[PDB]
């Protein structure tokens, strides 16, 4: 059990437990003023101050107020100021302060609180792990690496340190070295290791070193509630949405959109080819993280329901066409863009961020062989002037090993089972 009552505190324990029960009761206003009057009467009490701060914290969560939370943060700090403070209580108060600071985004302020905690309790390894997260939260991966190396020299089988250390190694491009750390840490079962993020990184690493075991771990993560299934692993999801990797135009209901794309495809192609030929700079490379190798770029017309006006100048007829279909131009979780992939390209298996969209691919220039795209367990090919539809919340992988360039048109639509109100109220990402 925890010991919070200083000797003095033990003396005035009677008043303090009363105010604390006033809080524990759930009557926040009462507890606040209760505790405040104790602070006034006995101003040196650590538990009196700690209760004041606890009440401020609860009032902040009740009022959804940042300005109140900021006062709680200082009062937690105040507790640490008073003399002869129980160590248990000190730990509690400063840890809560760090968590609230992190919540408000004061990442470096939290790091400071955490550094102090390590100064106070050099032998509490949990606090070293928390400090390591503090460093991660400011991008200081080198110091985080050092913190976790410390922890692991003294407690080699600490799973929290292991998973975070593996994450660090993988962010340093030591992908093979990171896999055992991630595995062992997840396998320890330790608090803080049952995190979808570590399953994600373990599986991504394994896939990038050709380790077939990845799907096993994906499956485990699904069983732990981190993934929708072994295949469908998006992060921002809405429940109750039909979930299959490949769709027919008929199944989406957006048959008029598919028809407009397929029937006017040479127009869409020609505008894109014109931008390649004359405004090549408008094609921005895709993220090399996803790309093992190759040459892969895109020209974006709509981003998250926002039309790119300077882009639609370069593809004016295609934009005029798309305007007729708010199911795609208003998809705030999707895009509309040209995508060009040159030979020798491999896009790592990956998943889109949401299950609230379906992704259409219109084939504009498709070499006769060498281009293929897998979603879940089905691998398909593009056809010039024909549309593919997949749920890119399902893992998918792309290969370009033709002798010429491959050009497609990417059109995102709201998942057809989302209601109008759902489409209006879904925050873009």
UniProtKB/Swiss-Prot annotation:
Signal sequence, start to end: none
Sugar attachment sites: 123, 377
GO biological process: activation of store-operated calcium channel activity; calcium ion homeostasis; calcium ion transmembrane transport; cell population proliferation; cellular response to calcium ion; detection of calcium ion; face morphogenesis; limb morphogenesis
Cysteine-cysteine disulfides: 312-319
Tissue localization of expression: Isoform 1 is detected in all tissues tested. Isoform 8 is mainly expressed in pancreas, heart, brain, kidney and liver. Isoform 8 is expressed in kidney (at protein level).
Gene name of the record: ASPH
Cofactor: Fe cation
Keywords, comma-separated and alphabetical: Calcium, Dioxygenase, Disease variant, Disulfide bond, Endoplasmic reticulum, Glycoprotein, Iron, Membrane, Metal-binding, Oxidoreductase, Phosphoprotein, Repeat, Sarcoplasmic reticulum, Signal-anchor, TPR repeat, Transmembrane, Transmembrane helix
Per-repeat ranges for TPR: 12-45, 125-158, 160-192, 196-228
Involvement in disorder: Facial dysmorphism, lens dislocation, anterior segment abnormalities, and spontaneous filtering blebs: A syndrome characterized by dislocated crystalline lenses and anterior segment abnormalities in association with a distinctive facies involving flat cheeks and a beaked nose. Some affected individuals develop highly unusual non-traumatic conjunctival cysts (filtering blebs).
Recorded superkingdom: Eukaryota
Keyword Chaperone recorded: no
EC number: 1.14.11.16
Family in the record: Belongs to the aspartyl/asparaginyl beta-hydroxylase family.
Protein name in UniProt: Aspartyl/asparaginyl beta-hydroxylase
Keyword Glycoprotein: yes
Residues of the full protein shown: 330 to 758 of 758
Positions with a binding annotation for 2-oxoglutarate: 296, 339, 359-361, 406
Residue sites binding Fe cation per the record: 350, 396
Catalytic activity of the protein: L-aspartyl-[protein] + 2-oxoglutarate + O2 = 3-hydroxy-L-aspartyl-[protein] + succinate + CO2
């Amino acid at each position: 059990k925890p010991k919070l009552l200083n000797k003095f505190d033990k003396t005035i324990k009677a008043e303090l437990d009363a105010a604390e029960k006033l809080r524990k009761r759930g009557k926040i206003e009462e507890a606040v003023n209760a505790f405040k009057e104790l602070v006034r009467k006995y101003p040196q009490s650590p538990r009196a101050r700690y209760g004041k701060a606890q009440c401020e914290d609860d009032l902040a969560e009740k009022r959804r107020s940042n300005e109140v939370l900021r006062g709680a943060i200082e009062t937690y700090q105040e507790v640490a100021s008073l003399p002869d403070v129980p160590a248990d209580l000190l730990k509690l108060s400063l840890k809560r302060r760090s968590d609230r600071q992190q919540f408000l985004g004061h990442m470096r302020g939290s790091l400071l609180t955490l550094q102090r905690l390590v100064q106070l309790f050099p032998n509490d390894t949990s606090l070293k792990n928390d400090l390591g997260v503090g460093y991660l939260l400011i991008g200081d991966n080198d110091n985080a690496k050092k913190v976790y190396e410390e922890v692991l020299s003294v407690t080699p089988n600490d799973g929290f340190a292991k998973v975070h250390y593996g994450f660090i190694l993988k962010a340093q491009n030591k992908i093979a070295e990171s896999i055992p750390y991630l595995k062992e840490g997840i396998e320890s079962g330790d608090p803080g290791t049952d995190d979808g993020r570590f399953y994600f990184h373990l599986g991504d690493a394994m896939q990038r070193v050709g380790n077939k075991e990845a799907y096993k771990w994906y499956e485990l993560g699904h069983k732990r509630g981190h993934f929708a299934s072994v295949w469908q692993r998006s992060l921002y999801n809405v429940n109750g949405l039909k979930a299959q990797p490949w769709w027919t135009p008929k199944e989406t209901g957006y048959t008029e959109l598919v028809k407009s794309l397929e029937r006017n495809w040479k127009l869409i192609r020609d505008e894109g080819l014109a931008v390649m030929d004359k405004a090549k700079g408008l094609f921005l490379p895709e993220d090399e993280n996803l790309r093992e190798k190759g040459d892969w770029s895109q020209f974006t017309l709509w981003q998250q329901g926002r039309r790119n006006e300077n882009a639609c100048k370069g593809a004016p007829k295609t934009c005029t066409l798309l305007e007729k279909f708010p199911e795609t131009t208003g998809c705030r979780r999707g895009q509309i863009k040209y995508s060009i992939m040159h030979p020798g390209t491999h896009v790592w298996p990956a998943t889109g961020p949401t299950n609230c969209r379906l992704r259409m691919h219109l084939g504009l220039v498709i070499p006769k062989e060498g281009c293929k795209i897998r979603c879940a367990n089905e691998t398909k090919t593009w056809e010039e002037g024909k549309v593919l539809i997949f749920d890119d919340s399902f893992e998918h992988e792309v290969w370009q090993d033709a002798s010429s360039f491959r050009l497609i048109f990417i059109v995102d639509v709201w998942h057809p089972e989302l209601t109008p109100q759902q489409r209006r109220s879904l925050p873009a990402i």
